[PDB]
Amino acid sequence: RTIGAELMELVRRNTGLSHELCRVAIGIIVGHIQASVPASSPVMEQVLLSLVEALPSGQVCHDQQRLEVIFADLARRKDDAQQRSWALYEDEGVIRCYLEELLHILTDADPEVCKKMCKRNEFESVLALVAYYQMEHRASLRLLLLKCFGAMCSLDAAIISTLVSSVLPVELARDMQTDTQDHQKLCYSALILAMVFSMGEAVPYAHYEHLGTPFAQFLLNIVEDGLPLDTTEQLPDLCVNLLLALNLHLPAADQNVIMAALSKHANVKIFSEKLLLLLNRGDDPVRIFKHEPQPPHSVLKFLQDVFGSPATAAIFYHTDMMALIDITVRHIADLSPGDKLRMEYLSLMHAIVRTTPYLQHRHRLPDLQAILRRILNEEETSPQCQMDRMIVREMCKEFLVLGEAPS
Amino acid sequence: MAYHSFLVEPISCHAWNKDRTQIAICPNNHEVHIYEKSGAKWTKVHELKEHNGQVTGIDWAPESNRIVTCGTDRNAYVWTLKGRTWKPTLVILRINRAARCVRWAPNENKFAVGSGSRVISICYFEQENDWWVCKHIKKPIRSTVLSLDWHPNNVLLAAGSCDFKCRIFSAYIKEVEERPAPTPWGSKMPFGELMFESSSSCGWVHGVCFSASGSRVAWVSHDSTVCLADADKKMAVATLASETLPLLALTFITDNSLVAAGHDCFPVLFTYDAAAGMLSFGGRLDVPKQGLDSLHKNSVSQISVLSGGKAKCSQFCTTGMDGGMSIWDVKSLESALKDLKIK
């Protein structure tokens, strides 16, 4: 009745395997004794169904016990005011052992266990580590906490709302501007910051003291000039994915803190080069997790906001804008009706004509004119397809030369 | 519904003995490998190595136990089992290009080979020199011949060609048989007489089979148009254009129903009603398997009748480019498909 769940607990204990491979090992063993010994097939098929399709009453998982023991000590070591500010005993080897064990459980065990024990009592255990991180100064332990937060964001999205609304993104954004020597901590800090901002949820206003415009200039100076200690050159492609994610919850490009960074910078070229290599493929590097509701496309959200003002539009060199128009045009046509993105490329194109002198050089204007007349003459009746046509009319109405026949 | 993968490469041709105890495949090479059915296993017993080229047609005479081969090397060889080994016996086809098909006769006194030389070679035995001399039928034909099947009279011959036609010829050899009895196809049946020539001129004729009665012949084409001519109804043709990839071989399981297979990688069924005068699609036979969804993972090139003859067949065999040979049981498909009906 409950065999398939009581075996997985036995196997994970005495082998250390993950949840997935625990089910594989049993499905293979059973599925092979069933075939070699047909006399046992009725018993085996019940056993397989228990896997495909709960635990006994008092029996509690091993991974659930450990998370009661780990979250309880780390919160006890947080509430130990003496040992934190006035150290006497050694703590780096014990804490490093509980945080390693935690990272192997969140990474391998069943997510629904690791979800409830983190969602328990209104995220009491998550929010402690977020404070212990603020309290701890040792980078050997700040690094393991980041690897643990990155595993908790993959489980649920309610945890992301808990972290982004907390003080974590303000300490990372403060440790990165200050402690630039540690390369791993600077590269993981920029990963977690992109995780928690991935969903587009808003944040307290107080975060913008350390996540505002001076933090963007710091990230642009790294994207453009790089660091000396960055030998492998991972950090520019992480400080790009982070800027794309900060700009997700930020509305009203005129009021945007990031765009004030671009318009203040002397010359951005490497940040613009990288935005187009992402647009050519239509890949959202911020979208690491498969959590609903799926937020918008981070790149187009950015470029829609770049071209929401003419001060930020002039960052693109001449050769790059023409490559941006060749791409946007190619996607508008290659995309099918009923897609969500087609109005984004259209709204993006509408933003280019306003804030740039597109009507003086008119690059790919004939190929564009033929595509908009098609989209208006499309007889589709979905609501989304009516939103596209609604944009095109506004685009042609504002600029008439986009409605004329190609010539 | 078996499936034994003899190899990974194609199987150009196959033939069964009388007992269906042994099978002679060509594993896409110059050799004929004879496998025997040991219980639920398949064991190779012989290998025939005389061809300078690839083999395209094999037939096994059931009574005499004499295998005949045809290959791209413009050769044929009649094999006789002397003791424990097969020994060949030479053939004189007199063709300037390669061969494509071969079929033993019912009475095992002749065979017919279809070639790319725009001919058909009616071969018979000559003990004066131990040769098998051949006579030609190349009056109307204009291109390669792909398939053949013998009438039960041991004289009349059907031939599917790449000229888009399925002609029917009279392979009467005076030296080895007396003049035949008449037939609804015609009385005047001397050597090399075009009795019936189809009308359609679109698509290559891949397969041809006579009916057990001898009064019905069907042919498959690359146009996805199965056909069937009835002599009782003044040689009228009934087509059934399919909505899938073409077929490459057919056979009469009964006097009314057929079974075809080809590039769709499974068999199907076709039903004929002489009252209405048309064909009808009897549905796919093999159930969709629980990308491809069948046993044959590539095309099928040859279909054969093991048990029950063409009069009423209980088991038929499929042989395909996927190095496989699948035996089918007809009644098992009747049961496993309650909708399925075999007329």
Added chain:
Amino acid sequence: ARNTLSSRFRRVDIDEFDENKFVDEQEEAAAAAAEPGPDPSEVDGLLRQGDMLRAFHAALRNSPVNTKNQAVKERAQGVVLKVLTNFKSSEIEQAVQSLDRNGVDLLMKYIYKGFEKPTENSSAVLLQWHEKALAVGGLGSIIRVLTARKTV
């Protein structure tokens, strides 16, 4: 190495003057008088009033397949290709479903001929037609375009 004898005999090609070359057949009865094809006034008068579905069948009823002449074929193509381009995208499934099998195959023949020489927007329509006729006729419809020895 190199040769120093006249090797010009290997240049002339004798295979051109051959007697075994293939010869396909044609309709003798059509060489004298060709099939008139869909008359423009018939279809057009049905297009003025907007009766597309009947101008549709009028164009597929007549088709000069047996004709050896190419102009009447070209005129016939421009007529039907003029008709398919004026359809309403929602009405196409309504029209394709009406046709029998032998009209779907003749349709797909004309479709694969419209792709040869396209106008500005002749092909975005024909790809929609191609989707419907394939949903009805399947791959076997296309095979009767490839195997067809007589063009539309």
Added chain:
Amino acid sequence: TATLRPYLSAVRATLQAALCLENFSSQVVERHNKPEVEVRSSKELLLQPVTISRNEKEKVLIEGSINSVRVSIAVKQADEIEKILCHKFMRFMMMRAENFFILRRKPVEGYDISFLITNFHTEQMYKHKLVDFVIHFMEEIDKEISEMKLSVNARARIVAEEFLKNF
């Protein structure tokens, strides 16, 4: 200038229609085995050509046969810098045509690349995966050119800075 989903849906269906192939020995030479679409000695074995096209420039040509298929393709080249990068890319793809077994070392006239698929590829290789390579090619080629146009423009800046910086 129509859409990309139906185009590849039409091409994919025509290809399954034309990869219905089988071996076939020659009837003009003694024991040759050639792809008849290339030699074109036997008219009866040559199916019709059929064309597909989003527009005037982009199109596909499937010349089928009993034992061969030829799939010529034309790619869109808006500007001159894209005509160059596509011309070179095919040359570097044709040079490795012994590794792309379904490839021609030169393209058909009027087209940018041409495939050739014999009856020995379907027997050995997976027929449904070969189609997926042609289709995967036709939708990635546009991305792999603009990624080079952007890479040429990025190089041209550094070559300018490394000269003007020294002033």
